[PDB]
């Protein structure tokens, strides 16, 4: 015959669950525990308590959710901990400079951008930010830098942004700091569940993120934020943050003092670029000036490294500020 | 422990279907599903 | 009077008022080399790919302005197969031969570039209802 | 009070059905339900 029969049949859907390619593990900060745990149980929680959470991206539109499997250490049998939904995420088209306050950033390859809502908590790399505005069509959002227990940091193009707020899979079991876990994420579809053998593995080391005190907030030097130019006298201003008072509220660095925490102080380290020269601890004020006594002893420090952190009962904050500033004025940089 | 941060009570399903109503038609007036008037109107040219 | 089916093929005879394809450029005028009981052979068509003329028809002038038409079962090389036999075909008369369309979208566009007028439904849906049992 | 020790979210139903496909048959190839291929193969003798 001449005519031939073409393929068209039913074209069955290709469910065939795949393993998750994009994912991440994190430690839940005090912000979520404050708003998800009742005060009676929360107050009894020790400073060393830690909680685990995971985030993932849907590999195909035919997958609804994924299952969480984890175990303690590198040995033992995985115990099912629950299922979670997909976390909206995107890629930064341009670098995010170190600057406090709102910043406009364009996102590429954004997923589930429609479901994002203002006021949510977003985490990238190791910085937690708050969304101020959203543009559905162009994927441009405004992010508040240095929020909760994080500080601004350089993020190269291609960094992944996760809007974990209300989109995270949480294991209710409490784990102490220093324990290493191995967990896997199994995709779930109407055709069934992904076989564990094909699931990627990962490990995380707990650090008691909720236990550590928040670092200082508004970090302004001589009235400027992260300045490379200071004319002589050195003035550094910092804000006092109390985790208990803030509770679930996201407060950025631009906000003023919110009071201190019981037994929480501020410690500052002074370096000569590589070497440690002076160290001031027990600071309770909102500003500090380099005493004139050590100016001649250390002499002119054109390259000065400023390190700021909060410590209570010998517990240092997970993150800290660190920048090398350049001094100008009389006696400073008269080679020009 | 306590009320979960969020609960997945249901799923929203999205489908894209292409269908034909037969030969050339002049005007589409309304769409009715399950006894409820989903949309009523009139269109006479290709459009959204 | 149905004349309508939701199948993959074109569902239109090449050259009809629905295909809107002009066959005059594709007309080939030739004198057959040899005529047999069921096969008419000509070397000119031997230069075309196998199956080029499949589905076409041969028309030649009988008397005045009236022509008699015959369909082609198959075309292979220099030999043409005529449905119902070659009886009544003049051995030296001038013959006009037109090609034939298989009806596949690839065939329709690659050969005739008439895809915009393609009346077939290749990949819109084969069975998918919106009132079935399980979508997956 | 608190999360129950366990929650009964659904039931699993088991049924034992005997049915006939007609007169003598030579081979059973596959079983399809709801558009999903449950089982595919070939058996030519009485067995499990
Ligand atoms: Fe055609």
SS (H, E, C) chain C: CCCCCCCCCCCCCCCCCCCCCCCCCCCEEECCCEECCCEEECCHHHHCCCCCCCCCEEEEEEECCEEEEEEEEEEECCEEEECCCCCCCCCCCCEEECCCCCCCHHHHHHHHCCHHHCCCCCCCCCCCCCCCCCCC
SS3 (DSSP) at B30: strand
CA gap C51, C30 in Å, rounded: 18
d(CA D48, CA D27): 14
For chain D, say whether C125 makes contact (Cβ under 8 Å): no
User: What is the CB-side half-sphere exposure of residue A207 using CA atoms within 13 A?
Assistant: 14
The answer to whether A6 faces chain C, any CB pair under 8 Å, is: yes
Would you say B33 and B40 are in contact if contact means Cβ atoms under 8 Å apart?
no
Per-window interface: D 1-48 vs A, CB < 8 A = 35-36
Helix (H) or strand (E) holding A84: strand A79-84
DSSP 3-state percent helix, strand, coil across chain B (nearest 5): 0, 30, 70
3-state secondary structure of A43: helix
How many angstroms separate the CA atoms of C55 and C83, rounded? Answer: 11
DSSP state string for A212-268: SPPPP---EETTEES-S-EESS-EEE-----HHHHTT----TTS------TT-EEEE
User: What is the distance in A from the centroid of ligand 1 to the CA of C16?
Assistant: 9
Q: Which helix (H) or strand (E) holds A279?
A: strand A276-283
Give yes or no for C123 touching B (CB within 8 A).
Answer: no
Cα separation, A222 vs A218, in Å, equals 12
**How many H-runs (helices) and E-runs (strands) does chain A carry?**
4, 24
How far is the C-alpha of A139 from the C-alpha of A89, rounded, in Å? 11
- Residue of A2, A303, A206, A282 lying closest to C71 (CA atoms): A2
Closest by Cβ to B18, choosing from C4, C124, C135: C124
- Starting at the earlier edge strand, list the strands of the sheet with A220-221: A224-225, A220-221, A235-237, A287-289
Chain C contact for A323, CB < 8 A?
Answer: no
Q: Which residues pair with C87 in a beta bridge?
A: none
Contacts of A335 (CB under 8 A, 6+ apart): none
| D24-39 burial code (b ≥16 CB/10 A, e <16) | eeeeeeeeeeeeeeee
Strands A169-176 and A160-162, by their bridges, are unpaired
Q: Nearest CA to A269 among A305, A302, A217?
A: A305
Q: Is the dihedral of CA D34, D40, D42, D46 positive or negative?
A: negative
Report how far Cα A23 is from the mean position of its chain's Cα atoms. 15
Closest-approach residue (CA) in chain B for C124: B18
Cα–Cα distance measured from residue A172 to residue A332, given in angstroms and rounded to the nearest whole number = 57
**Alpha-carbon distance values, D37 to A11, A13, B23, C84, D3 (Å):** 13, 12, 36, 47, 39
DSSP state of A214: P
SS3 at position A4: coil
Among chain B residues, the shortest Cα distance to A36 is held by B5
Residue D41: which H helix or E strand, with range?
strand D36-43
Token readout for C93 is 């008369």
C80, burial (CB in 10 Å: exposed 0-12, middle 13-18, buried 19+): buried
> Are the C-beta atoms of residues A286 and A242 closer than 8 Å to each other?
no
Give how far Cα C118 sits from Cα of A227, B7, B46, C6, C21, Å.
68, 50, 19, 13, 11
Q: Minimal Cα–Cα distance from B17 to chain C, Å?
A: 8
Separation of alpha carbons A143 and A171, rounded Å: 28
- The DSSP bridge pattern shows strands A276-283 and A287-289 to be unpaired
Tokens representing residue A313 in the block: 């009962």
Residue A68 in tokens: 């969480």
Say how far apart CA A180 and CA A168 lie, in whole Å: 20
Eight-state DSSP code of residue B34: T
Resolution of this deposited model, Å:
3.6
Exposure class string for B6-38: b at 16+ Cβ within 10 A, else e: eeeeeeeeeeeeeeeeeeeeeeeeeeeeeeeee
**Cα dihedral angle (A148, A151, A157, A162), rounded to 10 degrees?**
-20
Tokens of D33: 């339900």
Measured CA to CA in angstroms, residue C124 lies from A8, A11, A85, B46 at distances of: 10, 11, 32, 19
Neighbour tally for A190: CB within 10 Å: 14
Q: CA-to-CA distance for B17 and D9, rounded, in angstroms?
A: 33
In the 8-state DSSP scheme, what is residue A87?
P
Contact present, A76 and A94 (Cβ < 8 Å)? no
How far the first Cα of chain C sits from its last, in Å, is 38
**What is the C-alpha to C-alpha distance for residues C32 and C78, in angstroms, rounded to an integer?**
10
Q: Do C125 and B15 touch (CB under 8 A)?
A: no
Contact indicator for C53, C99 with CB cutoff of 8 Å: yes
CA of residue C120 to ligand 1 center, whole Å: 9
Nearest to A152 by CA among A208, A102, A204, A87: A102
Q: How far out from the chain centre does Cα A320 lie?
A: 12
Contacts of A10 in chain D (CB under 8 A): 35
Cα A203 to Cα A75: distance, rounded to the nearest angstrom? 12
What is the distance between the alpha carbons of residues A107 and A112, in angstroms, rounded to a whole number? 12
Alpha carbon distances (Å) from C61 to A209, A221, C43, C86, C89: 96, 102, 21, 15, 10
- Residue A191: list chain D partners with CB under 8 A: 36
- The answer to whether residue A62 neighbours chain B at the CB level (below 8 Å) is no
For tokens 């009988």, name the residue.
C62
Cα–Cα distance for residue pair A83/A25, rounded to 1 Å = 14
Chain centroid, CA A148 distance in Å: 9
Rounded to whole angstroms, the Cα distance separating A146 from A251 reads 8
Q: How far is the CA of D2 from the centre of ligand 1 (A)?
A: 70
Q: What are phi and psi of A251, to 5 degrees?
A: -120, 125
Q: Is C128 on the interface with A (CB under 8 A)?
A: yes
CA separation for the pair C29, A89 (Å, rounded): 67
Compare CB distances from A85 to B2, B3, B8 and report the shortest one's residue: B8
d(CA A263, CA A281) in angstroms, rounded, equals 13
Task: Measure the CA angle with vertex C119, ends C135 and C50; round to 5°.
Answer: 110
Query: Which residues in chain C are closer than 8 Å to D35, comparing Cβ atoms?
Result: 132-134
Which two tokens mark A262? 């019981």
Q: CA-based Rg of chain B, rounded to a whole angstrom? A: 19
Structure determined via: cryo-EM
On the 0-12 / 13-18 / 19+ scale of CB atoms within 10 A, A214 is buried
DSSP class of A328 = E
Cβ proximity of A67 and A185 under 8 Å? yes
Whether the CB-CB separation of A49 and A29 falls below 8 Å is answered with: no
Tokens of C26: 């594709």
- Chain B closest-CA separation from residue C124 CA (Å): 6
Q: How many CA atoms lie within 13 A of C85 on its CB side?
A: 3
For residue A200, CA distances in Å to A17, A54, C63 come to 14, 13, 82
At residue C105, φ and ψ (nearest 5 deg) are -60, -45
What long-range pairs does A277-281 form, CB within 8 A, spacing at least 24?
A281/A311
- Six token digits for residue A34: 């404050």
Q: Which protein residues have their CB within 5 A of the ion that is ligand 1?
A: C 10, 19, 101, 108
- CA gap A53, D16 in Å, rounded: 44
Structural tokens at position C37: 């009981």
Q: Can you tell me which residue has the tokens 């985790």?
A: A243
CA distance A35 to chain B (A): 9
CB-CB contact of A63 with A112 (8 Å): no
| Separation CA D10–CA D6 (nearest Å) | 12
Q: What are the C-alpha distances in Å from C97 to residues A46, A255, C108?
A: 94, 88, 19
Sign of CA pseudo-dihedral A123, A124, A129, A133: negative
d(CA A55, CA A87): 6
Query: CB-based contact (8 Å) between C122 and chain A?
Result: yes
Count other C-beta atoms under 10 Å from residue A43's C-beta. Answer: 9
Q: Is A124 strand, coil or helix?
A: strand
Q: Does D35 lie at the interface with C, CB-CB under 8 angstroms?
A: yes
Cβ separation of D36 and A191 shorter than 8 Å?
yes
Task: With beta carbons under 8 A apart, name residues in chain D contacting A12.
Answer: 35
C130 token code pair: 């919106």
Which of B3, B6, B11, B14 best probes binding to A when mutated, by most A CB atoms within 10 angstroms? B6
How many Å apart are CA A153 and CA A99, to the nearest integer? 9
Q: What is the 8-class DSSP label of residue D14?
A: -
Chain D residues whose beta carbon lies within 8 Å of the beta carbon of residue C134? 34-36
The whole-angstrom separation of Cα D19 and Cα D15 is: 13
Chains linked to C by 3 or more Cβ pairs within 8 Å: A, B, D
Q: Return the bridge partners of A221, or none.
A: A224, A236
Distance CA(A151)–CA(A124), nearest Å, equals: 11
């Amino acid at each position: 015959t001449g005519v031939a029969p073409p393929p068209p049949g039913w074209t069955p859907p290709d469910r065939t669950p795949r393993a998750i390619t994009v994912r991440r593990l994190i430690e839940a900060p005090y912000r979520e525990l404050a708003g998800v745990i009742d005060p009676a149980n929360l107050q009894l929680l020790d400073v060393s308590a830690s909680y685990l959470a995971a985030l993932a991206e849907a590999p195909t539109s035919l997958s609804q959710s994924y299952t969480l499997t984890d175990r303690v250490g590198s040995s033992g049998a995985f115990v099912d901990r629950g299922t979670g939904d997909w976390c909206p995420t995107g890629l930064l088209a341009a670098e995010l400079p170190l600057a406090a306050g709102p910043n406009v950033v364009t996102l590429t390859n954004a997923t589930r951008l429609e479901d994002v809502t203002v006021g949510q908590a977003a985490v990238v790399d190791d910085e937690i930010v708050r969304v101020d505005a959203v543009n559905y069509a162009s994927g441009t959002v405004t992010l508040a830098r240095g929020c909760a227990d994080t500080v601004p940091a350089k993020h190269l193009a291609g960094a992944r942004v996760w809007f974990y707020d209300t989109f995270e899979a949480v294991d209710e079991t409490v784990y102490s700091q220093g324990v290493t876990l191995q967990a896997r994420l199994l995709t779930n579809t109407s055709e069934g569940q992904l076989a564990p053998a094909l699931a990627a593995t990962d490990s995380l080391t707990l650090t008691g993120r909720q236990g550590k005190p928040y670092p200082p907030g508004q970090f302004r030097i001589n009235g400027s934020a992260y300045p490379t130019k200071v004319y002589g006298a050195l003035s550094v201003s910092w804000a006092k943050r109390d985790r208990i008072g803030q509770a679930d509220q996201l407060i950025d660095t631009t906000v003023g003092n919110i009071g201190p925490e019981d037994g929480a102080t501020v410690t500052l380290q002074v370096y000569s670029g590589t070497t440690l020269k002076r160290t001031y601890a027990g600071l309770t004020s909102s500003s500090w000036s380099y005493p004139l006594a050590e100016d001649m002893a250390d002499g002119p420090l054109q390259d000065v490294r400023l390190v700021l952190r909060s410590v209570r009962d010998g517990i240092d904050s997970w993150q800290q500020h660190d920048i090398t500033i350049e001094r100008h004025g009389l006696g400073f940089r008269l080679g020009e | 422990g306590a009320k979960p941060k969020a609960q997945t009570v249901g799923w929203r399903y999205y489908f894209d279907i292409h269908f034909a109503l037969g030969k050339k038609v002049d005007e589409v007036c309304a769409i009715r599903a399950s006894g409820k008037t989903a949309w009523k109107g009139s269109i006479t040219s290709n459009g959204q | 009077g149905l004349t309508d089916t939701y199948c993959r093929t074109c569902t239109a005879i090449v050259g009809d008022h629905r295909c809107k394809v002009n066959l005059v450029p594709y007309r080939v005028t030739l004198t057959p080399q040899s005529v047999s009981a069921w096969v008419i052979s000509s070397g000119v068509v031997a230069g075309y790919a196998d199956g080029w003329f499949t589905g076409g028809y041969v028309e030649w002038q009988v008397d005045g302005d009236n022509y008699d038409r015959r369909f082609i079962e198959q075309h292979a090389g220099a030999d043409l197969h005529i449905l119902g036999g070659t009886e009544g075909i003049p051995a030296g008369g001038q013959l006009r031969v037109y090609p034939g369309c298989d009806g596949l979208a690839q065939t329709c566009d690659d050969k005739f570039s008439n895809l915009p007028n393609f009346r077939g439904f290749n990949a819109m849906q084969g069975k998918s209802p919106f009132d079935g049992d399980q979508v997956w």
